[PDB]
């Protein structure tokens with residue numbers, strides 16, 4: 001697909017089809033294509049782009065944020081050829097990050113309790129990730145898995161007890177420090193050792209020389225990440 | 233060492249098959265490795281997907297290579313250069329132990345004088361003292377709408393590289409600091425760590441155009 | 444004195460009370476009074492709340508930074524501190540408190556339009572007459588040598604006032620400057636080499652807020668990302 | 682009064698007594714003076730002093746102590762309540778804000794803590810507007826609605842809301858210095874049962890840069906965390 005951006009930075013995500021109109025023809029968008037510019041009939045100018053998993057997530061049709069999604073893959077030590085349990089799935093986003101990490105051969109197993117959620121998710125993964133390497137289940141989520149990941153309100157519930165090897169993790173993405181602690185206590189019943197709790201930070205700078213300052217506006221918080229390590 | 237191997241798991245202590253971050257942090261040294269908080273982010277900044285062809289310089293201890301090599305896949309490839317001989321080795325030695333998959337081609341010598349192909353590279357991951365030098369050599373390799381990401385400690389180098397990128401076909405996309413605010417949680421004691429690593433380096437993202 | 448009103452959304456309104464004043468009526472607020480309620484709650488505004496809502500011409504210095512600047516200047520009561528520019532008089536109020544009635548704030552502003560609002564704002568909040576306002580550039584003003592305990596700066600080109608600051612400032616005292624761009628920091632720092640100044644501090648102040656409406660408890664989603672760097676230099680002896 | 686040096690290595694509090702040395706005698710230090718040379722000599726800042734002074738108990742960090750004043754919204758002439766005195770660090774920040782005509786009424790339960798606390802405040806700050814009391818705050822007899830602020834720094838702060846609310850005027854805050862987040866919620870949870878409308882929960886960060894051109898970067902070694910600041914404004918009864 002393609003990402004169309006203006007002067008302000010507002011971005012438009014387009015899936016071009018022949019005879020397609022965004023009043024701009026997709027043929028003209030493709031003429032330039034990624035790295036090129038197109039001028040509209042109102043003369044606007046919109047730079048044409050091939051989107052990253054970062055930009056797509058943000059403009060695709062409530063996703064897990066890129067900064068955090070990014071970190072989790074590193075938290076789960078996801079390497080190529082692994083199987084990971086996800087729920088999710090909601091709108092996707094974090095799936096793509098995982099599916100990307102497990103490489104064609106590797107599998108990512110995703111569950112989704114609601115229904116209309118998984119519909120949208122697959123649609124998004126469909127139209128960006130042509131590979132079929134994620135296993136989708138429409139439902140509320142032995143020692144065979146290499147990771148577990150959740151973007152639920154209640155990771156403490158579905159605590160996946162045996163569906164995880166030694167040296168594997170469960171990373172939960174919780175926006176309130178209460179939720180963490182409400183989840184952290186539950187590990188006094190299971191074989192786990194809290195290794196980490198952290199809040200990801202991506203501090204954007206504004207550099208338009210000689211202007212150079214951290215951005216006046218930023219998104220201070222999204223959520224915390226908690227890391228657990230199985231025993232045996 | 234046996235009880236460890238039969239543990240999985242405690243021992244008379246705890247024990248693990250190391251994760252990429254732990255390895256990196258505890259693996260051996262030649263030059264100071266790129267820290268994990270940024271490497272995690274950098275892979276996303278380069279938009280690395282499985283089957284991609286990424287450029288890299290330098291290797292130092294081989295820390296960045298691993299994050300890249302894991303990311304591009306067995307099919308995908310990481311072409312990576314290094315001009316300090318002892319340094320390339322440890323990266324050669326450190327990567328092989330944790331990454332036995334041979335999807336990483338190694339090179340001795342400056343990236344500046346590399347013999348590379350035009351518009352064959354999906355990304356250029358940079359970590360060295362004077363990034364502005366490889367700008368022409370990186371611009372040739374890189375494709376339209378792809379990125380070069382550089383790992384810069386001082387803000388002065390950021391502005392130096394950003395200034396020099398005027399002569400080359402890039403658009404400055406990002407300058408960012410990566411922050412992982414840690415905690416010490418032996419609950420009900422919960423507080424962010426009193427001791428934190430305040431800063432390693434800024435990340436500079438440059439997007440290629442066509443031409 | 445002025446009043447501050449807040450609603451269920453946390454949005455705040457700054458009021459000059461009067462008889463017959465119309466907001467809800469005014470003397471109805473008075474009779475309730477600070478901490479009271481009319482659902483709208485009424486307050487004696489803090490120096491922070493004031494700055495963030497006091498009528499502004501030029502942009503006032505942020506409360507988190509102004510707070511830190513007073514500490515970096517090490518201002519105790521009775522000290523004589525220099526200022527430029529007055530802007531809308533925000534940093535001035537912080538400075539005036541710190542040096543007290545026995546002390547003084549010698550402040551310069553180069554724009555007559557800005558200065559009035561700066562003065563109009565100080566006096567509606569600060570009744571103590573320990574501030575001497577001055578019109579014009581600090582670079583052209585006449586000062587006694589080594590007769591100032593501190594120089595507080597908030598302007599775009601602090602490097603042009605370095606010679607007169609180095610003069611006015613006592614031995615071993617501080618000059619702190621409020622600068623948004625890191626490039627302005629480096630310029631000022633390269634220029635400081637040419638005066639009797641030892642560069643002490645370059646820092647970013649951050650007041651990172653939370654929302655606690657238990658059971659919700661987290662750092663605020665939308666935060667004030669950045670204002671400016673604080674650069675502190677100490678005057679030598681000689 | 683006191684003096685602080687920095688060496689070529691640039692680190693560290695000389696207390697001049699007649700006929701003594703640091704190797705260069707005190708009288709030599711006074712003559713070279715503030716910004717003078719002998720190691721250099723300076724008249725310490727309140728920030729420098731708090732950090733390098735003797736501490737029986739750990740002081741409030743100057744960035745937090747600085748921010749505590751602004752949240753407490755203290756102007757000259759005010760009467761402010763403090764506990765615990767500890768080593769007397771935050772005590773000095775408070776006293777400067779209220780001025781000669783103001784008052785800092787400060788309590789401290791542990792005697793050895795109050796002792797060196799008094800010695801620390803007095804050596805540095807000789808204006809007489811600090812009131813010391815050995816003992817607890819929840820057991821102190823105070824005038825009702827006669828205090829413009831309450832600065833807290835103890836381990837179980839939720840225990841003085843009742844007594845703090847007594848002293849405080851309408852619309853005046855109670856700002857507390859608390860290391861753990863667990864600590865914070867309990868207070869917010871205890872404050873439910875008291876005439877208090879929670880206004881603020883905030884972290885302070887003074888992020889130092891190292892600038893030695895061409896070198897220019899935020900410091901590798903920072904202070905990760907000290908404590909949260911909790912501001913609680915009182916109801917008009």
Ligand SMILES: C[S@@+](CC[C@H](N)C(=O)[O-])C[C@H]1O[C@@H](n2cnc3c(N)ncnc32)[C@H](O)[C@@H]1O
Pocket residue numbers: 062063064065087088089090091092093094095112113114117140151152153154
């Ligand atoms: C929104 S996604 C979380 C973010 C996701 N990782 C992403 O792509 O950014 C999770 C979605 O799955 C659904 N869901 C998750 N757990 C659920 C549960 N336990 N019961 C019902 N629905 C659930 C919710 O609709 C929610 O919107």
Ligand SMILES: C[S@@+](CC[C@H](N)C(=O)[O-])C[C@H]1O[C@@H](n2cnc3c(N)ncnc32)[C@H](O)[C@@H]1O
Pocket residue numbers: 263264265266267289290291292293294295296297313314315316319341342343344359360361362
């Ligand atoms: C600081 S190390 C980075 C280590 C690596 N990123 C890691 O994670 O382990 C960077 C290395 O790049 C090398 N280098 C510097 N300039 C280079 C150049 N022009 N071409 C290739 N390597 C270079 C240096 O010798 C240095 O050892």
Ligand SMILES: C[S@@+](CC[C@H](N)C(=O)[O-])C[C@H]1O[C@@H](n2cnc3c(N)ncnc32)[C@H](O)[C@@H]1O
Pocket residue numbers: 501502503504505527528529530531532533534535551552553554557579580581582597598599
């Ligand atoms: C950002 S505003 C000051 C904000 C200040 N922190 C406050 O609370 O109002 C900058 C002001 O400094 C003044 N100024 C700029 N350059 C000056 C100079 N060289 N001498 C005196 N005043 C100056 C201008 O009038 C301008 O309104």
Ligand SMILES: C[S@@+](CC[C@H](N)C(=O)[O-])C[C@H]1O[C@@H](n2cnc3c(N)ncnc32)[C@H](O)[C@@H]1O
Pocket residue numbers: 738739740741764765766767768769770771772788789790791792794795816817818819834835836
């Ligand atoms: C960590 S110190 C406080 C530090 C202080 N804010 C400073 O800047 O130096 C704790 C001290 O507070 C005192 N304290 C603790 N609880 C108290 C209470 N409930 N009432 C009065 N003092 C108390 C104890 O004497 C202890 O030595």
